[PDB]
Amino acid sequence: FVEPKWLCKIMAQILTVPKNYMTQYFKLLEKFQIALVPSSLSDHRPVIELPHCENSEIIIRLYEMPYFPMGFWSRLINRLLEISPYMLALRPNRMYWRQGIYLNWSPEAYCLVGSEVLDNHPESFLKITVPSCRKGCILLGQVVDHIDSLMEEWFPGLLEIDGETLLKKWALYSFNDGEEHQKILLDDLMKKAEEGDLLVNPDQPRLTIPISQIAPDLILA
Amino acid sequence: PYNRMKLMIVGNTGSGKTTLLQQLMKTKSATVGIDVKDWPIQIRDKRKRDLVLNVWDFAGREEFYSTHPHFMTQRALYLAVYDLSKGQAEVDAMKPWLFNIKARASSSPVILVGTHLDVSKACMSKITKELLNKRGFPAIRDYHFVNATEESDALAKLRKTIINESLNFKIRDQLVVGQLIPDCYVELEKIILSERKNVPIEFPVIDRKRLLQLVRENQLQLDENELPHAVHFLNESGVLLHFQDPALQLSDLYFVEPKWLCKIMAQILTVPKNYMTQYFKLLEKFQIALVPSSLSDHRPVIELPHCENSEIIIRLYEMPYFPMGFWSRLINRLLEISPYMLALRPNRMYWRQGIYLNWSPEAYCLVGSEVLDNHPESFLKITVPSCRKGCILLGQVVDHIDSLMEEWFPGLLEIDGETLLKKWALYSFNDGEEHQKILLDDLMKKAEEGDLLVNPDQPRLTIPISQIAPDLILADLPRNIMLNNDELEFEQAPEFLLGDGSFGSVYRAAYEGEEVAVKIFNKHTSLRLLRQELVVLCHLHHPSLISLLAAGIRPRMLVMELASKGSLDRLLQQDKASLTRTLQHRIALHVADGLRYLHSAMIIYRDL
Ligand SMILES: Nc1nc2c(ncn2[C@@H]2O[C@H](COP(=O)(O)OP(=O)(O)O)[C@@H](O)[C@H]2O)c(=O)[nH]1
């Protein structure tokens, strides 16, 4: 491509609305993240009543950052496009919006990525919900690796240590027996440094939770 | 004589309703709720029949549309105001309202009223007299071009027409305006009207005990067993509202002054610490609770697991418009009450016009509005996988939808016959690879039950009717219950091989090498009730309960295991000596075991 302003203008033409190169046109349209148009996806979360409540049957992980990068969600949706299967096949149900994917195989083999806003926090979050079973653990591993790879490949400045690091990966655990709520949030690096043992324990050490059912990507589960 | 009838003032937003009403009653701000009132008409003719219309100024704004079909009854006259100013398009903008009057109250008059005559376009009578007269619409009986904000000869003629057209109602020659009632009913109505004044304004509700104290405190001779009939009749006339249903905890509270209830209920759609739980219960009864309205109206992208026309089952439902609160009641009805198995909670992705329950990649169910090209009508496409679990879901959904239509919107099924509701079934002779599913009306396929296949002009191709409409052929149930007509030796009706007790049409025959009793369901009735019976009896499976061997479509019959000695009634009436003490105890034990199993599954056998 010589005279690049023509390529860029032509590519941005369809976002406001050579018969030989039609297939190449579409290929580089996907390379620009235009193809299903990832932009103009109604921006409105549709109500989703998940099958599993109870804090001891789901695994949550957040991803905090001051804002979502420009083309963040588009590249992520494109990257997560059926490239994260529970098994090693079956195509899962998918309910996309502008900031989520929600692949769903079964009531115990689902995966919901999607922006979630919290009270008294101007920052942005990327809550990931996943069932606590084996198939759930597989999905969580793939998704975290995919997200981390994308960050390291496209947005390196969000990981450069100065050190708040501008990107703090949380892990929501609940010592509260699963019945009660308000999941205590623990920075991931601190839990990584807690690999010396195989359990997490509060001020009252009669309670305990295995780090597998909190962050099964660290312990090889 | 009961001189009282409901006047309902329908219309679109912004179009003059409360101002027309203020000038109709000579009683010299957006409506919230339905704003009930009542004006008495002292007719000065020789027949001085002093009648009292109670008006219902329906709110035009869309967010309230979920609660309106609860307050549309048959014994009522309708107005329909439509703002002449934006002529030639405001008439085509009120066809949804008229279609809804047609669905709910199919035999009630409608008096079209055109406001805003001061500004401008009076040739809107052309489209009113051509397209709006008889083509699926609720029998319009007058049309006026009136002004508001001032009384004149226009409003005078309009008021006299409302009066006249009211008195000559005559549903099947009944003359609603002058029927007879027990005197105790009108006495009860007068004491309620007096109680309207002596009650706290912050809470006008009255207690059933307070009502009992009131009816006793005066000479009203209404017995305790008579009160339900009386209070329900006053409900129909729009004096007081009440809900005798025991599913709610409201039957002790009798809503007097209904305009307060309606306004309070519609309060939350724009945004007494004891009755909070009852408040929420009747909030769901009005379809307000998760608020089914304001659900973003935008279908979210859904990439289903299964493409290929030979692996999914589609059914449409065509109608000119969706009724007012249609999708709300449907979502509420489909709320986890249709499980694939007989347990597991499924994934759900609601929007304003869909549900999409989803268990597994082969056990999903997607209901939702789907619009087609070159078709101004509305559709209700249902997608479902072709497997067994899919078939179960499709049966439940169709039965739920059909029940809702017959219960709430009867006018959408009344045969004249286009019927205003044409259920399609999308089949594809094209081997599944190719596309453009040929659509076949369901009644025609029902008439094609003589065979068990569908065949095109080129009969080398064929498709079994199971993989098209598994609710007609008995395949939606679990456990294939086909009859295998070869084994049967049934004799149609010789006045012989009869069950002997004439309980139904049950005969006697031999099937699978054993004697069996065959109940012949075949009659003028449809296959709904047959499916209802078949489901209940297909998964109970207890030794005390009678077990079903098979069922069959041609002709409609169901094959039950034969009881050798017949009913217990005949045995005790004619063979009393045969009952030993041990035998009596065994009969009692078996019946008790049946009741125990039935109550385990939360079923009440009632009459035993
Ligand atoms: N000038 C004029 N204004 C009218 C006429 N009919 C209605 N309006 C206007 O309509 C408004 C009333 O709207 P309203 O019926 O209360 O809305 P609704 O409660 O949603 O039905 C008033 O502000 C009137 O000015 C008319 O014939 N002439």
mmCIF file of C-alpha atoms in Angstrom, chain B residues 2-198:
data_model
loop_
_atom_site.group_PDB
_atom_site.id
_atom_site.type_symbol
_atom_site.label_atom_id
_atom_site.label_comp_id
_atom_site.label_asym_id
_atom_site.label_seq_id
_atom_site.Cartn_x
_atom_site.Cartn_y
_atom_site.Cartn_z
ATOM 1 C CA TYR B 2 -78.699 -1.417 37.274
ATOM 2 C CA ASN B 3 -77.981 1.800 35.373
ATOM 3 C CA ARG B 4 -74.185 1.670 35.285
ATOM 4 C CA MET B 5 -71.706 0.983 32.480
ATOM 5 C CA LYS B 6 -68.007 1.511 31.831
ATOM 6 C CA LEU B 7 -66.771 4.187 29.422
ATOM 7 C CA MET B 8 -63.159 3.653 28.392
ATOM 8 C CA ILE B 9 -61.187 6.493 26.820
ATOM 9 C CA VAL B 10 -58.443 5.013 24.682
ATOM 10 C CA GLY B 11 -56.016 7.041 22.581
ATOM 11 C CA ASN B 12 -52.428 7.909 21.761
ATOM 12 C CA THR B 13 -50.012 10.080 23.722
ATOM 13 C CA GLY B 14 -50.462 13.847 23.584
ATOM 14 C CA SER B 15 -53.859 13.454 21.925
ATOM 15 C CA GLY B 16 -56.612 15.116 23.916
ATOM 16 C CA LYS B 17 -58.277 12.739 26.374
ATOM 17 C CA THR B 18 -58.532 14.455 29.769
ATOM 18 C CA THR B 19 -59.384 17.754 28.056
ATOM 19 C CA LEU B 20 -62.103 16.111 25.949
ATOM 20 C CA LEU B 21 -63.359 14.508 29.170
ATOM 21 C CA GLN B 22 -63.267 17.830 31.034
ATOM 22 C CA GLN B 23 -65.433 19.292 28.258
ATOM 23 C CA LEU B 24 -67.771 16.284 28.105
ATOM 24 C CA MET B 25 -68.697 16.486 31.801
ATOM 25 C CA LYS B 26 -68.681 20.331 31.645
ATOM 26 C CA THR B 27 -66.104 20.439 34.467
ATOM 27 C CA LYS B 28 -64.585 23.858 33.838
ATOM 28 C CA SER B 29 -50.740 17.572 32.918
ATOM 29 C CA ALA B 30 -49.839 14.106 31.656
ATOM 30 C CA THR B 31 -52.031 11.242 32.840
ATOM 31 C CA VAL B 32 -50.396 8.752 35.219
ATOM 32 C CA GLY B 33 -52.268 5.483 35.648
ATOM 33 C CA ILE B 34 -55.777 5.371 34.212
ATOM 34 C CA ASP B 35 -57.420 8.155 36.254
ATOM 35 C CA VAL B 36 -60.830 6.680 37.026
ATOM 36 C CA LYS B 37 -63.827 8.982 37.503
ATOM 37 C CA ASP B 38 -67.608 8.785 37.049
ATOM 38 C CA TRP B 39 -70.222 11.218 35.748
ATOM 39 C CA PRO B 40 -74.019 10.826 36.057
ATOM 40 C CA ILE B 41 -76.118 11.497 32.939
ATOM 41 C CA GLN B 42 -79.623 12.737 33.790
ATOM 42 C CA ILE B 43 -81.425 12.001 30.526
ATOM 43 C CA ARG B 44 -84.281 14.487 30.169
ATOM 44 C CA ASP B 45 -86.391 12.377 27.781
ATOM 45 C CA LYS B 46 -89.630 10.608 28.719
ATOM 46 C CA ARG B 47 -87.406 7.627 29.588
ATOM 47 C CA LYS B 48 -85.560 9.518 32.326
ATOM 48 C CA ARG B 49 -83.026 6.709 32.784
ATOM 49 C CA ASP B 50 -80.412 8.370 35.002
ATOM 50 C CA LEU B 51 -77.278 6.476 33.989
ATOM 51 C CA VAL B 52 -73.784 6.766 35.459
ATOM 52 C CA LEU B 53 -70.801 6.209 33.202
ATOM 53 C CA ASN B 54 -67.516 5.669 35.010
ATOM 54 C CA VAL B 55 -64.751 6.843 32.716
ATOM 55 C CA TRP B 56 -61.295 5.277 32.472
ATOM 56 C CA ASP B 57 -58.939 7.869 30.973
ATOM 57 C CA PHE B 58 -56.230 5.484 29.752
ATOM 58 C CA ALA B 59 -52.732 6.960 29.713
ATOM 59 C CA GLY B 60 -51.173 7.203 26.272
ATOM 60 C CA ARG B 61 -47.508 6.896 27.245
ATOM 61 C CA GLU B 62 -45.879 3.609 26.329
ATOM 62 C CA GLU B 63 -44.301 2.600 29.657
ATOM 63 C CA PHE B 64 -47.760 1.919 31.172
ATOM 64 C CA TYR B 65 -48.926 -0.387 28.354
ATOM 65 C CA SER B 66 -48.125 -3.514 30.411
ATOM 66 C CA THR B 67 -50.956 -2.887 32.904
ATOM 67 C CA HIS B 68 -53.721 -1.707 30.562
ATOM 68 C CA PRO B 69 -55.035 -5.135 29.324
ATOM 69 C CA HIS B 70 -56.087 -5.875 32.918
ATOM 70 C CA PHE B 71 -58.661 -3.057 32.774
ATOM 71 C CA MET B 72 -60.220 -3.767 29.354
ATOM 72 C CA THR B 73 -63.500 -5.664 29.741
ATOM 73 C CA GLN B 74 -66.376 -6.600 27.455
ATOM 74 C CA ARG B 75 -69.256 -4.718 29.093
ATOM 75 C CA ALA B 76 -67.825 -1.312 28.183
ATOM 76 C CA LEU B 77 -67.854 1.319 25.455
ATOM 77 C CA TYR B 78 -64.631 2.737 24.037
ATOM 78 C CA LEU B 79 -63.531 6.131 22.797
ATOM 79 C CA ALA B 80 -60.458 6.578 20.610
ATOM 80 C CA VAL B 81 -58.957 10.062 20.194
ATOM 81 C CA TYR B 82 -56.346 10.604 17.528
ATOM 82 C CA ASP B 83 -55.239 14.251 17.057
ATOM 83 C CA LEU B 84 -56.444 15.314 13.567
ATOM 84 C CA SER B 85 -53.586 17.863 13.408
ATOM 85 C CA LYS B 86 -51.015 15.326 12.179
ATOM 86 C CA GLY B 87 -53.555 14.045 9.691
ATOM 87 C CA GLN B 88 -53.346 11.009 7.384
ATOM 88 C CA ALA B 89 -50.725 9.426 9.668
ATOM 89 C CA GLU B 90 -52.214 9.713 13.165
ATOM 90 C CA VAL B 91 -55.008 7.439 11.937
ATOM 91 C CA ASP B 92 -52.478 4.815 10.829
ATOM 92 C CA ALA B 93 -50.741 5.381 14.197
ATOM 93 C CA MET B 94 -53.718 4.252 16.316
ATOM 94 C CA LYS B 95 -54.293 0.906 14.595
ATOM 95 C CA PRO B 96 -52.394 -0.875 17.440
ATOM 96 C CA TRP B 97 -54.888 0.507 19.979
ATOM 97 C CA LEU B 98 -57.866 -0.582 17.847
ATOM 98 C CA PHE B 99 -56.364 -4.020 17.280
ATOM 99 C CA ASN B 100 -56.049 -4.367 21.054
ATOM 100 C CA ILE B 101 -59.673 -3.335 21.613
ATOM 101 C CA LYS B 102 -60.492 -6.050 19.063
ATOM 102 C CA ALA B 103 -58.448 -8.702 20.881
ATOM 103 C CA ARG B 104 -59.666 -7.994 24.422
ATOM 104 C CA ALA B 105 -63.292 -6.890 23.920
ATOM 105 C CA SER B 106 -64.251 -8.267 20.518
ATOM 106 C CA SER B 107 -67.915 -7.172 20.619
ATOM 107 C CA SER B 108 -67.730 -3.674 22.092
ATOM 108 C CA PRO B 109 -68.517 -0.476 20.158
ATOM 109 C CA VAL B 110 -65.879 2.132 19.347
ATOM 110 C CA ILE B 111 -66.551 5.842 18.862
ATOM 111 C CA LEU B 112 -63.694 7.454 16.939
ATOM 112 C CA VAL B 113 -63.060 11.038 18.035
ATOM 113 C CA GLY B 114 -60.844 13.462 16.159
ATOM 114 C CA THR B 115 -59.516 16.285 18.334
ATOM 115 C CA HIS B 116 -57.531 19.413 17.321
ATOM 116 C CA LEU B 117 -60.034 20.528 14.657
ATOM 117 C CA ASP B 118 -58.952 24.157 15.229
ATOM 118 C CA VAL B 119 -55.514 23.555 13.707
ATOM 119 C CA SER B 120 -56.067 22.361 10.104
ATOM 120 C CA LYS B 121 -56.658 17.973 7.083
ATOM 121 C CA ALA B 122 -60.257 16.881 7.753
ATOM 122 C CA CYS B 123 -59.963 14.488 4.765
ATOM 123 C CA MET B 124 -58.699 11.821 7.184
ATOM 124 C CA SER B 125 -62.278 10.515 6.906
ATOM 125 C CA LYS B 126 -61.121 8.913 3.630
ATOM 126 C CA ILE B 127 -58.724 6.439 5.262
ATOM 127 C CA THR B 128 -61.174 6.011 8.161
ATOM 128 C CA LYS B 129 -63.924 5.031 5.699
ATOM 129 C CA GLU B 130 -61.721 2.771 3.536
ATOM 130 C CA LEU B 131 -59.078 0.986 5.616
ATOM 131 C CA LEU B 132 -60.348 1.340 9.197
ATOM 132 C CA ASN B 133 -63.909 0.056 8.823
ATOM 133 C CA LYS B 134 -64.106 -3.748 8.755
ATOM 134 C CA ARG B 135 -60.628 -5.210 8.076
ATOM 135 C CA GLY B 136 -59.911 -6.874 11.404
ATOM 136 C CA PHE B 137 -61.052 -4.073 13.701
ATOM 137 C CA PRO B 138 -63.505 -3.766 16.621
ATOM 138 C CA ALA B 139 -66.729 -2.714 14.868
ATOM 139 C CA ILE B 140 -66.570 1.067 14.670
ATOM 140 C CA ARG B 141 -69.979 2.698 15.046
ATOM 141 C CA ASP B 142 -69.333 6.468 14.753
ATOM 142 C CA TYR B 143 -66.556 8.925 13.962
ATOM 143 C CA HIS B 144 -66.542 12.606 14.880
ATOM 144 C CA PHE B 145 -64.331 15.609 14.151
ATOM 145 C CA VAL B 146 -64.635 17.466 17.445
ATOM 146 C CA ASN B 147 -62.872 20.400 19.055
ATOM 147 C CA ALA B 148 -61.849 20.568 22.714
ATOM 148 C CA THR B 149 -61.350 23.374 25.287
ATOM 149 C CA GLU B 150 -64.788 24.803 24.392
ATOM 150 C CA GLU B 151 -68.300 23.391 24.121
ATOM 151 C CA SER B 152 -70.097 23.695 20.787
ATOM 152 C CA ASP B 153 -72.472 21.830 18.478
ATOM 153 C CA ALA B 154 -69.654 19.366 17.738
ATOM 154 C CA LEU B 155 -69.172 18.300 21.365
ATOM 155 C CA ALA B 156 -72.953 18.398 21.861
ATOM 156 C CA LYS B 157 -73.491 15.905 19.034
ATOM 157 C CA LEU B 158 -70.578 13.810 20.320
ATOM 158 C CA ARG B 159 -71.995 13.687 23.857
ATOM 159 C CA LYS B 160 -75.471 12.751 22.614
ATOM 160 C CA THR B 161 -73.947 10.021 20.435
ATOM 161 C CA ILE B 162 -72.064 8.537 23.406
ATOM 162 C CA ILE B 163 -75.324 8.509 25.396
ATOM 163 C CA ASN B 164 -77.434 6.923 22.630
ATOM 164 C CA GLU B 165 -74.813 4.365 21.537
ATOM 165 C CA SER B 166 -74.429 3.372 25.196
ATOM 166 C CA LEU B 167 -78.112 2.614 25.861
ATOM 167 C CA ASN B 168 -78.413 0.460 22.718
ATOM 168 C CA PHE B 169 -75.576 -1.909 23.595
ATOM 169 C CA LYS B 170 -77.352 -5.306 23.396
ATOM 170 C CA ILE B 171 -74.669 -7.976 23.584
ATOM 171 C CA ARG B 172 -76.668 -10.884 22.084
ATOM 172 C CA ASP B 173 -79.883 -8.927 22.791
ATOM 173 C CA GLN B 174 -79.274 -8.302 26.489
ATOM 174 C CA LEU B 175 -79.545 -4.489 26.926
ATOM 175 C CA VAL B 176 -76.701 -4.145 29.444
ATOM 176 C CA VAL B 177 -77.844 -0.688 30.534
ATOM 177 C CA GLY B 178 -81.159 -1.911 31.930
ATOM 178 C CA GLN B 179 -80.664 -5.422 33.269
ATOM 179 C CA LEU B 180 -81.960 -6.585 36.649
ATOM 180 C CA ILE B 181 -79.975 -7.278 39.823
ATOM 181 C CA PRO B 182 -80.714 -8.303 43.414
ATOM 182 C CA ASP B 183 -81.539 -5.215 45.464
ATOM 183 C CA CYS B 184 -78.856 -6.173 48.003
ATOM 184 C CA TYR B 185 -76.201 -5.542 45.334
ATOM 185 C CA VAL B 186 -77.154 -1.899 44.799
ATOM 186 C CA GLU B 187 -77.485 -1.483 48.574
ATOM 187 C CA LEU B 188 -73.940 -2.819 49.007
ATOM 188 C CA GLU B 189 -72.742 -0.392 46.326
ATOM 189 C CA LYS B 190 -74.258 2.597 48.154
ATOM 190 C CA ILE B 191 -72.611 1.696 51.475
ATOM 191 C CA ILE B 192 -69.250 1.380 49.698
ATOM 192 C CA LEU B 193 -69.739 4.830 48.139
ATOM 193 C CA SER B 194 -70.374 6.269 51.608
ATOM 194 C CA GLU B 195 -67.309 4.422 52.934
ATOM 195 C CA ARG B 196 -65.274 6.163 50.210
ATOM 196 C CA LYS B 197 -65.466 9.387 52.236
ATOM 197 C CA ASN B 198 -64.787 7.910 55.705
#
